[PDB]
UniProtKB/Swiss-Prot annotation, chains A, B:
Changing E44G: In AMYLD1; amyloid polyneuropathy. The lineage of its organism: Eukaryota, Metazoa, Chordata, Craniata, Vertebrata. Thyroid hormone-binding protein. Probably transports thyroxine from the bloodstream to the brain. Changing A99T: In DTTRH; increased affinity for thyroxine. Changing F23I: In AMYLD1; Jewish 'SKO' amyloid polyneuropathy. Changing V10I: In AMYLD1; late-onset amyloid polyneuropathy with carpal tunnel syndrome. Changing V61A: In AMYLD1; amyloid polyneuropathy. It comes from Homo sapiens. Belongs to the transthyretin family. GO terms for cellular component: azurophil granule lumen; extracellular exosome; extracellular region; extracellular space; protein-containing complex. This is Transthyretin. It is found in: Secreted; Cytoplasm. Changing Y59H: In AMYLD1; leptomeningeal amyloidosis; vitreous amyloid in some patients. Changing S67Y: In AMYLD1; amyloid polyneuropathy. L-thyroxine binds at K5, E44, S107.
Amino acid sequence: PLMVKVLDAVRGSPAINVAVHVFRKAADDTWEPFASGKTSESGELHGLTTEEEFVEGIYKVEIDTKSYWKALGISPFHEHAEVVFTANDSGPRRYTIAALLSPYSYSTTAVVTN
Amino acid sequence: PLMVKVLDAVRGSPAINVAVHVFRKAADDTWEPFASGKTSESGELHGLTTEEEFVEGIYKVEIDTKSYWKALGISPFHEHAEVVFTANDSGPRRYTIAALLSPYSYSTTAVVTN
Amino acid sequence: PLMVKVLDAVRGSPAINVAVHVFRKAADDTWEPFASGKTSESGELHGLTTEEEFVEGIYKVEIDTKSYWKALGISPFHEHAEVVFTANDSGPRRYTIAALLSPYSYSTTAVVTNP
Amino acid sequence: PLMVKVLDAVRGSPAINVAVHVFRKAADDTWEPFASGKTSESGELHGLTTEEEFVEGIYKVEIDTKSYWKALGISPFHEHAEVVFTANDSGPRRYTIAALLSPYSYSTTAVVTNP
């Protein structure tokens, strides 16, 4: 139900081996670890969760952009990119969180389909 | 060797049934039709060309964004989105031209892989 | 030293009356409230801080995009856009945090200048 | 009535000395040169046209992104960014064409205001 895709706007490539952490907002308003991984050779991270586990609520996707750029020998601006959203059962069932990275800028979009 | 992908930033969806025209720059500097189609249900347009036909040169991808938005009952700013680039044999072999559409804005990126 | 500018990609206009909250990471690793304000009719937010107050640190600029879109009667995807960065670690700089908003997508860019 | 502003997403800075060519579609469907200029040290290009001259029509703003990146010694993907739009068809408006550049990607947004 949840896929994360990361692209590199400098090189025109997938952003490979980027660490991604997903958190779910707990009742006390803290962020609890939910799932994590590293993007693949295609810049994608599949298998984070299942339909049963991905219940409605507020989630945060943190993308470790700073490590990515530093490994390329580039100093970037942001500490990470964060994407915070509510999962809603009314809407379509599959969420792709896409991010497009540059050293001083990033874009993110949600593609939500059935 | 060439794929075009179009997303809708307003609805968080693929942009479906968007007309896309590809042109190749001729020796006289005019744009000659090269390939065309409409994006699919996944917002993608596959099968535009073959490796044999997609020789080095300058290409233009014109995306009919204005018709897309008008069919959704929205008045948009741009007449179309245009992506102009050189195909280069030195670089990786597969080109994805991605576009992210809003009524008054668009983003485009090239993902070039082997 | 810190300015925030927000545009609306749907309207082709400044994004007006967007709430922005800035935090700074404290010694204990918590996010301490640092400054807040709203974008004006030009989509800009000036006056958040001073050169003296804007010391080195890790800052988070929270742009309340959901509140913006809901005040316009639109159901958007994100809760907010968060921009997190180290500032002033090589001496004072001027930071513009720009954001471009759509209901299911946003962009942010930093322009950093040395006075 | 027409301003162009360009940022560099790699540097986190204005994109300086970017060449911009504006065309207007003629009666015969050709692109007629309309105005041109370069972005300043602030990444802005002012003074392209006048209220009188900027009549209704279909305009193309060509931002010479390859020339910009090649002047910096970088091999980018696109030849240029083209922004094509109908202007002034409900009376005079003020247009800002903004662009954010990276070597393999760009964004453009229009801010349209009624004076």
